Amino acid sequence: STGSATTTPIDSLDDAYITPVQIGTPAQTLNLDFDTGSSDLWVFSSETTASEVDGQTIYTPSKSTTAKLLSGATWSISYGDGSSSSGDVYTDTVSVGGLTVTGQAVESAKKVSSSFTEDSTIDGLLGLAFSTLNTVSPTQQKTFFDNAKASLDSPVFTADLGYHAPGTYNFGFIDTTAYTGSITYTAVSTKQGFWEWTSTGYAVGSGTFKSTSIDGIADTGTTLLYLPATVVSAYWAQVSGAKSSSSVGGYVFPCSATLPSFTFGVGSARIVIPGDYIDFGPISTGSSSCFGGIQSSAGIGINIFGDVALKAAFVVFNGATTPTLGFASK
């Protein structure tokens, strides 16, 4: 089997991407944030504290003839940005772009943090990291991908995120029309539960490539590109007036600037992030100080190839017995 679904930016900055997901019978369609940096599929629901729901579409398990309470199971997750959610668990039928999994754990939120409430466009998350990170207790549950894998034509999914435009998540096949040149594959460590890999270096603008190993995660659920302080300083030094602002929480730059591109290495191959992709707009409405899309990972504990990086590429998440990651230009 295969599946193919369009993923759409939630706003004009590409802060996140939503993908429609069918849950239950009859289908209840929710727009979920596909997150290769976590492993829980959780939704706003009829069980979510009412004051914490503000415009989201909810899953109502009592209206699904295929929903079953997973007795005794609870979940609770905290994300890198400090957001969180928790609740109980059902199994139900879940379909993405025509690919159906029966008996998928659907984690129903009883509580969500304010950042989730405040984002009306995201109805939940669909985790695509390794199932070892799944938070359901006392019986850990599998991701949608992990459940689908054996049925797929090939044990892969691909992320093709757009810049200010829709893109695609495919399951079970590689669309050879969706990228240019070849796909370069690179090793993955699953030891931390992530799609963790090592970039071979970087360049800023038209500058020379610096060969240096940068260990990080491919994370569709993180907006920005978080890299070591040395790398980030080298980037922003090429932008007149850019500075790190402790009050704002990262590098800012004059909105009048033209940003240079940023290149990262994948083996001997190179992915070029256009300068425009690095602009996250005014720090507050009407400001001429703009927020940068490349920020320091110091204090996170890991480098994160988030959407800023991934949307410059066609990315293969190869879930073969030994997982790997592939990157192509597009």
Ligand X SMILES: COc1ccc([C@H]2SCC(=O)N2C2CC2)cc1
Based on the shown chain and the rule CB under 6 A, indicate whether residue 283 belongs to the binding site for ligand X. yes
Determine whether 35 is an active site residue: yes
First to last CA, the chain: 25
Enumerate the β-bridge partners of residue 217. Answer: 196, 304
Q: Give the x-and-dash track for 146-185 against ligand X (CB under 6 A).
A: ----------------------------------------
**Nearest alpha-carbon partner for 37 in 150, 138, 159, 121:** 159
**Nearest alpha-carbon partner for 34 in 163, 159, 133:** 159
How many residues touch ligand X (CB under 6 A)?
9
Give the range of 204-212, 231-239, 263-271, 280-288 binding ligand X by CB under 6 A: 280-288
**Nearest alpha-carbon partner for 33 in 23, 22, 20, 46:** 20
Based on the shown chain and the rule CB under 6 A, indicate whether residue 204 belongs to the binding site for ligand X. no
What are the structure tokens assigned to 130, written together?
């390794």
Choose which of 291, 314, 317, 327 interacts with ligand X (CB under 6 A): 291
Determine whether 199 is an active site residue: yes
Based on the shown chain and the rule CB under 6 A, indicate whether residue 220 belongs to the binding site for ligand X. no
Cis peptide before 138 (omega within 30 of 0): yes
What are the structure tokens assigned to 67, written together?
């929903």
Choose which of 58, 178, 234, 248 interacts with ligand X (CB under 6 A): 248
Based on the shown chain and the rule CB under 6 A, indicate whether residue 310 belongs to the binding site for ligand X. no
Spatial distance between the Cα atoms of 6 and 17, rounded to a whole number of angstroms: 10
CB atoms within 10 A of CB 25: 13
Identify the active-site residue in 199, 261, 296, 297. 199
Choose which of 8, 10, 15, 29 interacts with ligand X (CB under 6 A): 15
Based on the shown chain and the rule CB under 6 A, indicate whether residue 280 belongs to the binding site for ligand X. yes
Give the residue numbers annotated as catalytic, written as ranges: 35, 199
- Give me the residues that bind ligand X (CB under 6 A), please: 13, 15, 223-224, 248, 280-281, 283, 291
